[PDB]
């Protein structure tokens, strides 16, 4: 068998990126319904280095897009972030393409390369991902307004708002847009991820994108692995040696073990909450995840949390 030992980057969680937006991780959370499933298309990488969906290697390529648009029009014909063509059934979307569902995207973009000498290069626009012309898998999306000058734009989601034409639905970052196609193996979405069972719940890493939401509260995007983890696996390509990787969350000041977690080959992290009001969301953010040993999908984890005084 192949046996190169499994490692997780030795940096505290405070300093790492979300893998769906390029923003620092502000906390850990459980999903509002701890049985619900996710189908994020970023933050999707196997722990042996195989990225899924649209997951890019680098934070610099995350939640970004690039396409041509002819001046006067609203149709953005996507390519890959580096300019190279995106073929119309190659994947659900070009690499690093945004995967935030149930929201309007309010975008900012500029022409690349630069050609200007005066003026402001930034154009703001917006997308309604639930619209019929939102077909990234066919290599085009339709912006809300016309773009006065046509060319090669690269841009990002600058802020989000609750999704229009959705019956007044709230911003919900647990969902993804409708995109992708069954018509080809490559255009199929990275699959849903379900809680494995065993009383285990999926641990999410939360970060913030600007945007009004219906409750006047943090606008927090969940993902499954910090991006630096994902880039590490892509380099390492450690052999999967068991159905689950036991991890301890360690306080590096004392190398104390703050709790057991299972890291599954599919690229997601679980624990067993102490109770319905406790869980990893109480843990400090300056801790470090450390490989302990390969285990079973049948490994019984110690529960994580407490709540009293």
């Amino acid at each position, epitope marked *: 068998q192949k046996t190169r030992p499994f490692t997780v980057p030795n940096i505290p969680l405070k300093y790492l990126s979300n893998s769906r937006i390029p923003n620092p991780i502000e906390g850990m959370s459980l999903s509002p319904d701890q049985t619900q499933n996710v189908q994020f298309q970023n933050g999707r990488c196997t722990i042996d280095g195989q990225p899924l969906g649209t997951t890019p290697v680098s934070v610099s390529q995350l939640c970004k897009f690039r396409g041509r648009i002819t001046s006067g029009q609203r149709v953005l014909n996507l390519t890959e972030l580096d300019g190279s063509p995106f073929m119309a059934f190659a994947a659900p979307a070009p690499a690093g393409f945004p995967d935030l569902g149930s929201c309007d995207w309010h975008i900012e973009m500029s022409k690349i390369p630069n050609s200007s000498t005066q003026n402001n290069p930034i154009v703001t626009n917006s997308v309604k991902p639930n619209s019929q012309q939102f077909v990234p898998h066919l290599s085009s999306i339709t912006l809300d307004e016309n773009v006065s000058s046509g060319g090669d734009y690269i841009g990002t989601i600058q802020w989000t708002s609750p999704p229009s034409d959705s019956g007044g639905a709230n911003t919900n970052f647990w969902k993804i847009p409708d995109y992708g196609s069954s018509l080809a193996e490559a255009s199929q979405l990275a699959p849903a991820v379900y809680p494995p069972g*065993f009383n285990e719940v999926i641990v999410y890493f939360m970060a913030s994108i600007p945007g009004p939401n219906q409750s006047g509260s943090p606008n927090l995007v969940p993902c499954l692995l910090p991006q630096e983890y994902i880039t590490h696996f892509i380099s390492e390509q450690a052999p999967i040696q068991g159905e689950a990787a036991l991890l301890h969350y360690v306080d590096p000041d004392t190398n104390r073990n703050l709790g057991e977690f299972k890291l599954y080959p599919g690229g997601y992290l679980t624990c067993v909450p102490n109770s319905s009001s406790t869980g990893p969301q109480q843990l400090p953010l300056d801790g470090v995840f450390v490989f302990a040993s390969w285990v*079973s*999908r*049948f490994y019984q984890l110690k529960p994580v949390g407490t709540a009293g005084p």
Partner: single-chain antibody
Amino acid sequence: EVQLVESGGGLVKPGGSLRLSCAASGFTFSSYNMNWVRQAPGKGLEWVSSISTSSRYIYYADSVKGRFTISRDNAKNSLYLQMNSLRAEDTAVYYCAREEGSVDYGMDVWGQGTTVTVSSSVLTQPPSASGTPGQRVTISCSGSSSNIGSNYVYWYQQLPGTAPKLLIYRNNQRPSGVPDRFSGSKSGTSASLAISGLRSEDEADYYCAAWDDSLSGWVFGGGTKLTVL
């Protein structure tokens, strides 16, 4: 209707080969992990082997590593075990069983089996227990650090002659259709099944089972014959 059907076993003799098949219908074969469990006449359950949905993860029992290889073809909806260089110890009914995610991948559905005849346990349970009707009887299951100490204990109920059915997964959860008279518990490296309100229909052979990290496979109790007076 959901069903596994097994074939191709029968009255071989030593050094020989035998290919068993198992046929699934009523559910998506490709969506399920599959095991082989064999059962020597009058002896206990022995987990043989196990293959994951897309054949990526394959495990064997220490006593068949080298001689048996498992395989599946999800197109032809069949599981296979080609058994090679068979000895007398390989004489049993060979069941194929399916793992069901909603019960923590306990074997929820077993076929009727196929008999392979040839001529020329780690978890510890009581061999038998007995109880007068309406009593409570408890059966103990004891193992070591690499099984019960680390992993969830499951419990199988095997009715007189019948193929087994999952009684308890995850130490103490009860599948859909198991009376609450059956509760389960685990403590350190030990576990226990408790049957309260005893009924004549409870007369069966009871097994405990846990994944053993050392062996990298399933590991079964010797089985407890519960007699209902």
